[PDB]
Design a binder for these strands. Structure first.
Length: 146
RNA sequence: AAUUCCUUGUCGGGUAAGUUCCGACCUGCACGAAUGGCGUAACGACUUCUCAACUGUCUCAACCAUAGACUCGGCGAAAU
């Protein structure tokens, strides 16, 4: 009753991190510039906020090296990520309008999700959901020569 | 709660290699139903599995008798 997610302020968290990056001019190449703007999301259960920020920084570096460009650092906490959605219940509708201030329909989740989670969180925001392992595989696919 | 989708390998028993299975651990909207879900002795030419004994089922076949097949006489078809 009045809890929605049945938790503390971990229920709803628009942390926004530290604004991982906010891209600008001097990288405008062709109509197809680096417009793959990505919003990161994660969950912080076992550890400290400093190491969670470090993990988000690592994910941001990975997404930046793999083309694309990060512009958000949300951290929403839940002891056990909803094995139905990765970030939460009301966050499903919340992200839909959160991504409207940004406008690139790409969300990257810091962790290995399962197909139910992928499709649920996708349909909840109408954007493309990308795993950390998927991003690493993309980096290898791009750098592989032999 | 007496809830098994619980192949979320969540380990062992069973054998040389193991299926049906039995047990603690992972299993939160999941849950199914408010009168439909759980237990149940006895019973069943119902479905699945493990043993003791037994065997030509098999490794791998061999011999004997009878009814046809085959030879002689008689009557004498059929689908196409």
């Amino acid at each position: 009753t009045g809890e929605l997610a049945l938790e503390d302020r971990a229920s709803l968290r628009r942390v926004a991190g530290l604004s991982t990056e906010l891209a600008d001019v001097s990288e405008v190449e062709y109509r197809q510039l680096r417009l793959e703007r990505v919003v990161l999301v994660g969950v912080w259960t076992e550890g400290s906020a400093a190491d969670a920020e470090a993990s988000l920084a690592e994910l941001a570096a990975l997404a930046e090296t793999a083309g694309s460009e990060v512009l958000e650092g949300l951290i929403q906490r839940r002891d056990k990520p909803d094995p139905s959605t990765y970030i939460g219940s009301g966050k499903a509708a919340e992200l839909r309008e959160v991504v409207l201030a940004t406008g690139a329909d790409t969300v990257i989740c810091d962790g290995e999700l399962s197909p139910a989670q992928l499709n649920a969180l996708e349909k909840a925001v109408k954007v493309k959901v990308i795993d950390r392992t998927a991003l690493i595989l993309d980096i290898f696919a791009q750098h592989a020569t032999s």
